[PDB]
RNA sequence: UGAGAAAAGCCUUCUCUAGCGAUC
C-alpha cells in the first residue's frame, strides 16, 4: 500500500530539499509539492489501474520541470542540474515504461513517450524507445518512416 | 457387481498370473530357501509375474542392513514394479485397495490378519507357505498344489 | 450484419444495394444507415467468418429480399387503406379507441351493426373469451381487459389504473358505436 | 536460464524472453503458481517481438510449413531481425529446431523447462498480444481451423447440398402462400365481375387478367384483341366481352380499385419468384447430383435428398429403405413427378417401384463420391427402367 | 431476496433456462398417470421412481414424425390425442385389463367387508 | 413397439448439466438441439413448446452408454472447451456440441479423409465445432489451431491410447483438467484377459502424471469395454 | 489402381481371406451382397468387410468404408469379384461380403488373426 | 429436546471463491 508510495516520496525528498537550498522554492511550496505528489502517487499504486492517472502524473512532473526551468533563468542558478532534473526525468521514464508495458496497443502513448524522450531525454534512451515500438508494431509503415526520419 | 465373477468363480483370471507379494512373504521364502519365481511356477504350472508395490519396497528398506539380501532379490528384472501414491508406508491397506479395484491379482502373504481380510473379498485367491512348499487357497485351477 | 442491424427492412435494403463483402468497402450506405453505424458495418467486412458464395447463390438471395421489401410497401398501403375506410364508415370509433382496435372490434362481431347490439360490458371483455368462460366455470374472478388492452388510453395509464380506464372507455365507446351505426350523418364531433 | 522461446499461433509468430525460473522444482505444487498466475508470469516472461499474419492465405501457408517442420520465409524474417548474433532458442517441435539450426546459427532446445513455459504462454497468450492485431485470437483459430481442413481433404465448395434442402422447404412454403392470396383476390374481384372465376381455372392466370382489366366498363375493340393474346384461345375472350356487357356485378369505388390492383399485382410477382426458384433448383441439382436428376427428375430427386437430410445419408441407406422415403408421397408409385415412356399395369405396379428404388440408390452413390459428377450413368439407368417397363407391358 | 426469487423461477443456465410451468388440473392429471405406469401393463416391469414428488421444472411436447419410419413407427392422426390421459382412455387393451383388475379387488373387498 | 411419432411426452433435466430425460412410456436420453429441425444420423427428435431435443443412442455412442451406466462425472458442461480425439463421422460429436452450447467449443480430430469430409459438412451447420484433419499421434503438427482446453475425450481405439492421450494432455490440457478415455480391451492386447488389460492401462496413466479416479464397464451395450475418468495435475486442496 | 481402393491385400493375404470366406459359408456365418453387408453394419454383427476393387463403378461400394469407420470394423479390398464369387458359393461375381458375429463359433481364432492382419495394412 | 416451539423486520461478528495487483 503506502510502503511503495513512502519509498517513492523518500526518493523524491532529496531533490526537494536541494531546491529549498537553492532558494528557488519556499518551504510551503515544498509542502504543497509533497502533498500533491503523494496524492498523485496513491492513484497509480492501486490494484485497479487507469491510464489517465499515469497521464496526470506525467503532466504534473512536466509542469514542475517547466516551472523549475523558468525560475532558474530568473535566479541565474545553473548548478545542480543532475541532482534534480535528471532524477525527475528518470522517474518520468520509469512511469512511461510501466504505462507502455501495461498498454502496448496504444500508439498515442508510444508517441507521447517519443516526444518526451526527444524533449528531455538522452538520444540513446530515445533509440531504445524506437526499438520497443518497432518490435511489436512492425505492421505500420508510418512508424518505420518516423524512425528513419529521426 | 464385477462382470468378471460368475458367482464366486473368477473367469478373467488367466494363466498369466499377476500376483501381489507381501514383505513378510519374501523373508520366509529365503528362510526356507525357496526360489521365488521357480516355486510359484511349480505350484501353478504356469507363468507367474510377481508384483511389488512401492509401499512393500519401502518396508523392506526400513528393515535395515540385516535384511539387505531380500532387498536385492526384490529388485529383479523379471519382477513387475508398479507405483502407488499413498501418504504413508502401511502396505496391508495398499494391497487390499488394489484387490477391491481390479479383482485380477492373487494375494501372496503369510500374515494371518491380512488373509482373514482378503477372504471377505469375493473371487480372489490367497497364496501362502505350508511346510516347505507353496500353497494356494481359493483357486479352482490349483492343479499341482500340495495335496492333503 | 444480423447482430448489428435489427430493422428487417434496413437489413434487406443493405443486401439489395451490395451483394458481397468485397463491395462493402467501396460502396456507401449513408442514405440507409447512420454514419457512425456504417463504419462498424464497414469494419466488420474485412474480419469475417463466412464462406464465399457463388454468383447464382447471391442472385437468389437478392430476389428473395426484393420480395420482402415489396410486402412492406404494400402492407403500408393496405394499412393506409384501412385508415381511410375506418375514417369514413365509423369516424367516431376511430377517434376514441383507434383505427386498429376498432377494426379488430368490428371483425370479431362480424359487422358494425352486430357490434352495436352489444352492451358496454361485453365490448370491454369481447377479446378475452378464454379467460371469461374459464373463470365462470371455476367460479374465479372475471377478466377486465379484453381487446381494449391495446387501446391508446389504456396503454398510457399505470397498471393500477388500467382496470378503471377499461370500463370508462368501454362505456363511452358503445355510445360512438350506436351513433355511427344508426346516425345518418358522418362527423367526429361527438367522438372528440 | 535466460533464453528465447518461439510460440506459433494462428494470428502470427511471437518471440518471448524468459528472465528467471526455478527449473528443478517447476513441476511441484507451490512453484507451479509461477506460470499459472498472470501476475507472476509477467514477472519472468516478456514479449520482445510479435509478427502477425497479413491475410488468411498467408496464415494457411505458415500453418502448412509449421506442420511439415520447414522454416517459412516469414519465420526467418522475424528470427533474423530481433535476435542478437550463444543464443538459446526454445521450440516445440524437434524437426523445426534442426531446420532453424541449419539455416541460422542459433542453438535450439526442444524439451525441459521450455515445455512448461510454452504452456504458460499458451494459457496467457490473449493477454500478452491484446490489441496488437485487428482479428481476435478466438476467431483466427476458428477461421484457420476450417481452411486447414479443406486443403487436406481437397474439399469442393460447389458440391455442397445445403441449398437443396432450403429450396425444397421454401417451395412448399411458397405454394401455400400463393394459394391463400389467390383465393382472396378472386373473392374481392368477384364483387365486381363474378363471371371471370368460372372461365379461368388457374390462380396465376386469374391475377394476370385482373391486372389487365380494372373495370368491365372498358373492355372493347383493340383491348379485346389484346385480351385475346393473353387468353390461350380467342373464343373465350369474345365470350368475356359478352360477360362484361351482361353481368350481375356491382360497381366498385375508385379507392377499392386501387387496393385490389396493387394486391393482385403482388401475387403475380410472388409467382414469378417461385418460377425463378424452381429454375435455380434445377441448375443446382445438375451440379450436385446429375445422375440422380437424369434418372428420376430434378424435382423428385431433390425431394429424396430432403427426406434423407443429406446426399451422404441417401447413399448410406440400403435399397429397401430408400423406397420408404418415397412411401408417404408415392414418389415411386405415382408415375406419369417422374415421367417414363410406357405404362405399368396395376399388377406390376409394386414390382416396378421396387426396381426403380434400387436404381436410385445406385445413382445416389455415384453422385456422392465422384471425382467429377457426370450424368451418363443416369441415362443408362433410365434406359434399363424403360426396358423393364416394356417387358411387363407387352410380355417380352 | 428479490434476486433469489428471480433465480427460482428458472432451472438455470446449466439447462438453458427451463421455466417451471403453472400447475393445472390437466397437467397434474398427466403427471399422476406417469407415476403409476407400472400397473398399466401386467407383462411390463419398471424401475422405481426417481422422486416421490413431482419435478419442479418440466416441459410437454410431442415426438416429430420421420419420413423413414412411415411403416415401422408412426401413429395415424386419427388415433393421436391431445394429452396422455386421453390416450389411456382410447386404447382398448389398457381399459380391458384395468376393469378386470378393479372389479376383482372390489369383489374381493366385498367379501372382506362381509 | 417404442416411442412412436405423435406421442405426448415430458422432458426433465438430468443430474448432469446439459443432459435431459425424455419421460414417457419409455425413457430416452436427450440433448437440446443446437440446430433445430435437423437430424444428424436419423435419430428421433421431440418438439417442445421453438425448443427441440434429439435422442441419444447408447449403442452407437460410448459416452451415452457411460451416462446410462451410472457414471459419476463426465465433466462436459455448457461453456467448456473440449478436445475430441477420434471424431470419425461426428455422431457423438454432435451430441457433445449440444451439451457445450454456443459458448463452448469442440475440437474434432480425425485422420481419415473419408470421414473428414463429413465433419466439415457438420461444421458448416454448427459454429462451435472446429474440424482438425490430422493424425492424433503428432499433437505438435496442429498446435497452432488449438488453445488450452478443459476436457479431453479419447475414442481412438489404438494399442497406444495412453501415449496418444498423454502427449495431447501435456500440450493442450490445462491444469486441473479432466479426461474421459474409452478402452476396448480387445484392441490393446487380444492375448491378455479384458480386466487384466484394464489394470495395465490404469497403471500407465499414473506413470504419465495423470490421476485416474473412476472406471466402469459398458456391459449392457458393449462387451469388454471400459471408461476411465480422471484429473490431470490436481490443484492442492 | 484407383487410389480409393487403399487397403489392397497382397497375394499371401488374399489366399487367407478367400479361404476364411469359404469356411464361413459352410458355418452359416456369411452375408453376401452390398445391401446385405450394409444391414449387418447397422445391426453391429460384422467382423470385417471384404470388397472387390474391380467393380466397373467402384463407387457403388464406397459407402461401406464410411460405415466401417463409425463401427470400428476392419475392411480390405481384393482384385477379383469373380474369385470372390467362388468362395461365397455363388455362380455370380460378388463385390462385397460380410462375416457375421456368431457366439461360440470355432472360427474365432482364425477371424481374430485376420482382424489383426487387416489393421496392420493401415500402418 | 427442554435460554419451549414457530414466524417476520434491524445491527454485530465472520467464512468461501472469482477477477484484479505485482512488467519500472
Ligand atoms: Mg503387514
Ligand atoms: Zn503401496
Swiss-Prot record, chain A:
HAT repeat ranges per the UniProt record: 121-150
UniProt-annotated location(s): Nucleus, Nucleolus
Membrane-spanning intervals of the chain: none
Subunit structure: Part of the small subunit (SSU) processome, composed of more than 70 proteins and the RNA chaperone small nucleolar RNA (snoRNA) U3.
Family listed: Belongs to the UTP6 family.
Role summary: Part of the small subunit (SSU) processome, first precursor of the small eukaryotic ribosomal subunit. During the assembly of the SSU processome in the nucleolus, many ribosome biogenesis factors, an RNA chaperone and ribosomal proteins associate with the nascent pre-rRNA and work in concert to generate RNA folding, modifications, rearrangements and cleavage as well as targeted degradation of pre-ribosomal RNA by the RNA exosome. Involved in nucleolar processing of pre-18S ribosomal RNA.
The protein's name in its UniProt record: U3 small nucleolar RNA-associated protein 6 homolog
Organism, as annotated: Homo sapiens
Encoding gene, per UniProt annotation: UTP6
Span covered, complete protein: 1 to 150 of 597
Curated annotation (Swiss-Prot), chain D:
Presence of keyword Transferase: no
Domain Nop: residue ranges: 288-394
Compartment(s) of residence: Nucleus, Nucleolus; Cytoplasm; Nucleus, Nucleoplasm
GO annotation, cellular component aspect: box C/D methylation guide snoRNP complex; cytoplasm; fibrillar center; membrane; nucleolus; nucleoplasm; pre-snoRNP complex; small-subunit processome
Keywords attached to this entry: Acetylation, Cytoplasm, Isopeptide bond, Methylation, Neurodegeneration, Nucleus, Phosphoprotein, Ribonucleoprotein, Ribosome biogenesis, Spinocerebellar ataxia, Ubl conjugation
Keyword Transcription regulation on entry: no
GO term, biological process aspect, one: rRNA processing
Single GO term (MF): RNA binding
Modified residues annotated as Omega-N-methylarginine in this record: 343
Family that this chain belongs to: Belongs to the NOP5/NOP56 family.
Illness the protein is tied to: Spinocerebellar ataxia 36: A form of spinocerebellar ataxia, a clinically and genetically heterogeneous group of cerebellar disorders. Patients show progressive incoordination of gait and often poor coordination of hands, speech and eye movements, due to degeneration of the cerebellum with variable involvement of the brainstem and spinal cord. SCA36 is characterized by complicated clinical features, with ataxia as the first symptom, followed by characteristic late-onset involvement of the motor neuron system.
Record-given protein name: Nucleolar protein 56
Organism: Homo sapiens
Swiss-Prot record, chain E:
Record localization: Nucleus; Nucleus, Nucleolus
Organ and tissue specificity: Widely expressed with higher levels in testis.
Superkingdom to which the source organism belongs: Eukaryota
Record-listed cross-link Glycyl lysine isopeptide (Lys-Gly) (interchain with G-Cter in SUMO2), residues: 19, 28, 56, 101
Function summary: Regulates the transcriptional activity of DNTT and ESR1. May function as a chromatin remodeling protein. Part of the small subunit (SSU) processome, first precursor of the small eukaryotic ribosomal subunit. During the assembly of the SSU processome in the nucleolus, many ribosome biogenesis factors, an RNA chaperone and ribosomal proteins associate with the nascent pre-rRNA and work in concert to generate RNA folding, modifications, rearrangements and cleavage as well as targeted degradation of pre-ribosomal RNA by the RNA exosome.
Subunit organization: Forms a ternary complex with DNTT and core histone; interaction with PCNA releases DNTT and H2A/H2B histones from this ternary complex. Interacts with ESR1, ESR2, PPARG and RXRA. Part of the small subunit (SSU) processome, composed of more than 70 proteins and the RNA chaperone small nucleolar RNA (snoRNA) U3.
Protein name per Swiss-Prot or TrEMBL: Deoxynucleotidyltransferase terminal-interacting protein 2
Organism listed in the record: Homo sapiens
Lineage: Eukaryota, Metazoa, Chordata, Craniata, Vertebrata
From Swiss-Prot, chain G:
Gene Ontology biological process: box C/D snoRNP assembly; maturation of SSU-rRNA; mRNA splicing, via spliceosome; ribosomal small subunit biogenesis; single fertilization
The family this protein is said to belong to: Belongs to the eukaryotic ribosomal protein eL8 family.
Record region (Important for U4 snRNA-binding): 91-123
InterPro entries hit by this protein: eL8/uL1-like (IPR050257), H/ACA_rnp_Nhp2-like (IPR002415), Ribosomal_eL30-like_sf (IPR029064), Ribosomal_eL8-like_CS (IPR004037), Ribosomal_eL8/eL30/eS12/Gad45 (IPR004038), Ribosomal_eL8/Nhp2 (IPR018492)
Region (Interaction with U4 snRNA and U4atac snRNA): 31-43
Cited Gene3D superfamilies: 3.30.1330.30
Organism field: Homo sapiens (Human)
Residues the record lists as Phosphoserine modifications: 117
Protein name: NHP2-like protein 1
Domain of life from the UniProt record: Eukaryota
SUPFAM superfamilies: L30e-like
Amino acid at each position: 500500500m503506502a510502503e511503495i508510495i513512502q519509498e517513492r516520496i523518500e526518493d523524491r525528498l532529496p531533490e526537494l530539499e536541494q531546491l529549498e537550498r537553492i532558494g528557488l522554492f519556499s518551504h510551503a511550496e515544498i509542502k504543497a509539492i509533497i502533498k500533491k505528489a503523494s496524492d498523485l502517487e496513491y492513484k497509480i499504486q492501486r490494484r485497479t489501474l487507469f491510464k489517465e492517472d499515469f497521464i496526470n502524473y506525467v503532466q504534473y512532473e512536466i509542469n514542475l520541470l517547466e516551472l523549475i526551468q523558468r525560475r532558474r533563468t530568473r535566479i541565474g542558478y545553473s548548478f545542480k542540474k543532475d541532482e534534480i532534473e535528471n532524477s525527475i526525468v528518470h522517474r518520468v521514464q520509469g512511469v512511461f515504461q510501466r504505462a507502455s508495458a501495461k498498454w502496448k496497443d496504444d500508439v498515442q502513448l508510444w508517441l507521447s513517450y517519443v516526444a518526451f524522450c526527444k524533449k528531455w531525454a538522452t538520444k540513446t534512451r530515445l533509440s531504445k524507445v524506437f526499438s520497443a515500438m518497432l518490435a511489436i508494431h512492425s505492421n505500420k509503415p508510418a512508424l518505420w518512416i518516423m524512425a528513419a526520419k529521426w | 457387481h464385477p462382470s468378471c465373477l460368475f458367482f464366486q468363480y473368477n473367469t478373467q483370471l488367466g494363466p498369466p498370473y499377476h500376483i501381489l507379494v507381501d514383505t513378510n512373504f519374501i523373508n520366509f521364502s529365503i528362510k526356507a530357501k525357496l526360489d521365488l519365481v521357480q516355486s510359484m511356477m511349480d505350484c501353478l504350472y504356469a507363468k507367474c509375474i510377481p508384483c511389488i508395490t512401492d509401499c512393500v519396497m519401502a518396508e523392506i528398506e526400513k528393515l535395515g542392513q540385516k535384511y539387505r539380501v531380500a532387498l536385492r532379490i526384490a529388485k529383479d528384472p523379471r519382477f513387475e514394479r508398479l507405483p502407488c501414491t499413498h501418504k504413508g508406508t502401511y502396505a496391508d491397506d495398499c494391497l487390499v485397495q488394489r484387490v477391491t479395484q481390479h479383482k485380477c491379482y492373487i494375494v501372496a502373504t503369510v500374515d494371518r490378519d491380512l488373509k482373514r481380510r482378503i477372504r471377505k473379498i469375493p473371487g480372489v485367491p490367497i497364496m501362502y507357505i505350508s511346510n516347505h512348499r507353496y500353497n494356494i487357497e481359493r483357486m479352482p485351477d490349483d492343479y499341482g498344489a500340495p495335496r492333503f | 450484419l444480423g447482430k448489428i442491424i435489427s430493422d428487417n427492412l434496413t437489413y434487406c435494403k443493405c443486401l439489395q444495394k451490395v451483394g458481397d463483402r468485397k463491395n462493402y468497402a467501396s460502396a456507401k450506405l449513408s442514405e440507409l444507415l447512420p454514419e457512425e453505424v456504417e463504419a462498424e458495418v464497414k469494419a466488420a467486412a474485412e474480419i469475417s467468418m463466412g464462406t464465399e458464395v457463388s454468383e447464382e447463390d447471391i442472385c437468389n438471395i437478392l430476389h428473395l429480399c426484393t420480395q420482402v421489401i415489396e410486402i412492406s410497401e404494400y402492407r403500408t398501403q393496405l394499412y393506409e387503406y384501412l385508415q381511410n375506410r375506418m375514417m369514413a364508415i365509423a369516424p367516431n370509433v376511430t377517434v376514441m379507441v383507434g383505427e386498429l382496435v376498432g377494426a379488430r372490434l368490428i371483425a370479431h362481431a362480424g359487422s358494425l351493426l352486430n357490434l352495436a347490439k352489444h352492451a358496454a360490458s361485453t365490448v370491454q371483455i369481447l377479446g378475452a373469451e378464454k379467460a371469461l368462460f374459464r373463470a365462470l366455470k371455476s367460479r374465479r374472478d372475471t377478466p377486465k381487459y379484453g381487446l381494449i388492452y391495446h387501446a391508446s388510453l389504456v396503454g398510457q395509464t399505470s397498471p393500477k389504473h388500467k382496470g378503471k380506464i377499461s370500463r370508462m372507455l368501454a362505456a363511452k365507446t358503445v355510445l360512438a358505436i350506436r351513433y355511427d351505426a344508426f346516425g345518418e350523418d358522418s362527423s367526429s364531433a361527438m367522438g372528440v | 536460464v535466460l533464453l528465447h522461446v518461439l510460440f506459433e499461433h494462428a494470428v502470427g509468430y511471437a518471440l518471448l524472453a524468459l528472465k528467471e525460473v526455478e527449473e528443478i522444482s517447476l513441476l511441484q505444487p507451490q512453484v507451479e503458481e509461477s506460470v499459472l498466475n498472470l501476475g507472476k508470469f509477467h514477472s519472468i516472461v516478456r514479449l520482445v517481438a510479435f509478427c502477425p499474419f497479413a491475410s488468411s492465405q498467408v496464415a494457411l501457408e505458415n500453418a502448412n510449413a509449421v506442420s511439415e517442420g520447414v522454416v517459412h520465409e516469414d519465420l526467418r524474417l522475424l528470427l533474423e531481425t530481433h535476435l542478437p548474433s550463444k543464443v538459446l532458442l526454445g521450440v516445440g517441435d524437434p524437426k523445426i529446431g534442426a531446420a532453424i539450426q541449419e539455416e541460422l546459427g542459433y542453438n535450439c532446445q526442444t524439451g525441459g523447462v521450455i515445455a512448461e513455459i510454452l504452456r504458460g504462454v499458451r494459457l496467457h497468450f490473449h493477454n500478452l498480444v491484446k490489441g496488437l492485431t485487428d482479428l481476435s485470437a478466438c476467431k483466427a483459430q476458428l477461421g484457420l481451423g476450417h481452411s486447414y481442413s479443406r486443403a487436406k481433404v481437397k474439399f469442393n465448395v460447389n458440391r455442397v447440398d445445403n441449398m437443396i434442402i432450403q429450396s425444397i422447404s421454401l417451395l412448399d412454403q411458397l405454394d401455400k402462400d400463393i394459394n391463400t392470396f389467390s383465393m382472396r383476390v378472386r373473392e374481392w374481384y368477384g364483387y365486381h365481375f363474378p363471371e371471370l372465376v368460372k372461365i379461368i381455372n388457374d390462380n396465376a392466370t386469374y391475377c394476370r387478367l385482373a391486372q389487365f382489366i380494372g373495370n368491365r366498363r372498358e373492355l372493347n375493340e383493340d383491348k379485346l384483341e389484346k385480351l385475346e393474346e393473353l387468353t390461350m384461345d380467342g373464343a373465350k375472350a369474345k365470350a368475356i366481352l359478352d360477360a362484361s356487357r351482361s353481368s350481375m356485378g356491382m360497381d366498385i369505388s375508385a379507392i377499392d380499385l386501387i387496393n385490389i390492383e396493387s394486391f393482385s399485382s403482388r401475387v403475380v410477382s410472388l409467382s414469378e419468384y417461385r418460377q425463378s426458384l424452381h429454375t435455380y433448383l434445377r441448375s443446382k441439382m445438375s451440379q450436385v447430383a446429375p445422375s440422380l436428376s437424369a434418372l428420376i427428375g430434378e424435382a423428385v430427386g431433390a425431394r429424396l435428398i430432403a427426406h434423407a437430410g443429406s446426399l451422404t445419408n441417401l447413399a448410406k441407406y440400403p435399397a429397401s429403405t430408400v423406397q420408404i422415403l418415397g412411401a408417404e408421397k408415392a414418389l415411386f408409385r405415382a408415375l406419369k413427378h417422374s415421367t417414363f415412356i410406357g405404362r405399368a399395369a396395376a399388377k406390376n405396379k409394386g414390382r416396378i417401384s421396387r426396381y426403380l428404388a434400387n436404381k436410385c440408390s445406385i445413382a445416389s452413390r455415384i453422385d456422392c463420391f465422384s471425382e467429377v459428377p457426370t450424368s451418363v450413368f443416369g441415362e443408362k439407368l433410365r434406359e434399363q427402367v424403360e426396358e423393364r417397363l416394356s417387358f411387363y407391358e407387352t410380355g417380352e | 431476496k428479490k434476486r433469489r426469487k428471480e433465480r427460482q423461477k428458472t432451472a438455470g443456465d446449466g439447462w438453458f433456462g427451463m421455466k417451471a410451468p403453472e400447475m393445472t388440473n390437466e397437467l397434474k392429471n398427466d403427471l399422476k398417470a406417469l407415476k403409476m405406469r407400472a400397473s398399466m401393463d401386467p407383462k411390463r416391469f419398471y424401475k422405481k421412481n426417481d422422486r416421490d414428488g413431482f419435478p419442479k421444472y418440466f416441459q410437454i411436447g410431442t415426438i416429430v414424425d420421420n419420413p423413414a419410419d412411415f411403416y415401422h413407427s408412426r401413429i395415424p392422426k386419427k388415433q393421436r390425442k391431445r394429452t396422455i390421459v386421453e390416450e389411456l382412455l382410447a386404447d382398448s387393451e389398457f381399459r380391458r385389463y384395468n376393469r378386470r383388475k378393479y372389479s376383482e379387488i372390489m369383489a374381493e373387498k366385498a367379501a372382506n367387508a362381509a | 413397439r417404442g416411442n412412436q411419432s405423435g406421442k405426448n411426452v415430458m422432458v426433465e433435466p438430468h443430474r448432469h448439466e446439459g443432459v435431459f430425460i425424455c419421460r414417457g412410456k419409455e425413457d430416452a436420453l436427450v440433448t437440446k438441439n443446437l440446430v433445430p429441425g435437423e437430424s444428424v444420423y436419423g435419430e428421433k427428435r421431440v418438439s417442445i413448446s421453438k425448443i427441440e431435443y434429439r435422442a441419444w443412442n447408447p449403442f452407437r455412442s460410448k459416452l451415452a452408454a457411460a451416462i446410462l451406466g451410472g457414471v459419476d462425472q463426465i465433466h462436459i458442461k455448457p461453456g467448456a472447451k473440449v478436445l475430441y480425439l477420434g471424431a470419425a463421422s461426428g455422431t457423438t460429436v454432435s451430441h457433445v456440441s449440444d451439451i457445450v452450447g454456443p459458448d463452448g467449443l469442440v475440437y474434432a480430430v480425425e485422420f481419415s479423409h473419408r470421414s473428414g469430409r463429413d465433419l466439415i459438412n457438420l461444421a458448416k451447420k454448427r459454429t462451435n465445432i472446429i474440424p482438425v484433419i490430422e493424425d492424433a499421434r503428432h499433437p505438435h503438427k496442429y498446435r497452432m489451431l488449438i488453445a488450452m482446453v478443459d476436457v479431453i475425450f479419447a475414442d481412438v481405439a489404438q494399442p497406444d491410447q495412453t501415449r496418444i492421450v498423454a502427449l495431447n494432455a501435456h500440450t493442450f490440457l490445462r491444469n486441473g483438467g479432466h479426461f474421459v478415455i474409452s478402452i476396448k480391451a480387445n484392441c490393446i492386447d487380444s492375448t491378455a484377459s479384458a480386466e487384466a488389460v484394464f489394470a495395465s492401462e490404469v497403471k500407465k496413466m499414473q506413470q504419465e502424471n495423470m490421476k485416474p479416479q473412476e472406471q466402469l464397464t459398458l456391459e449392457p451395450y458393449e462387451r469388454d469395454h471400459a471408461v476411465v475418468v480422471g484429473v490431470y495435475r490436481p490443484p492442492p486442496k | 489402381v484407383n487410389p480409393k481402393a487403399y487397403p489392397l491385400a497382397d497375394a499371401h493375404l488374399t489366399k487367407k481371406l478367400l479361404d476364411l470366406v469359404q469356411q464361413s459359408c459352410n458355418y452359416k456365418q456369411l452375408r453376401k451382397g452390398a445391401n446385405e453387408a450394409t444391414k449387418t453394419l447397422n445391426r453391429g454383427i460384422s467382423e470385417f468387410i471384404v470388397m472387390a476393387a474391380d467393380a466397373e463403378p467402384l463407387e457403388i461400394i464406397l459407402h461401406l468404408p464410411l460405415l466401417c469407420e463409425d463401427k470400428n470394423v476392419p475392411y480390405v479390398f481384393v482384385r477379383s469379384k469373380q474369385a470372390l464369387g467362388r468362395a461365397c458359393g455363388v455362380s455370380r461375381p460378388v463385390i462385397a461380403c460380410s462375416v457375421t458375429i456368431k457366439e461360440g463359433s470355432q472360427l474365432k481364432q482364425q477371424i481374430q488373426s485376420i482382424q489383426q492382419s487387416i489393421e496392420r495394412l493401415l500402418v
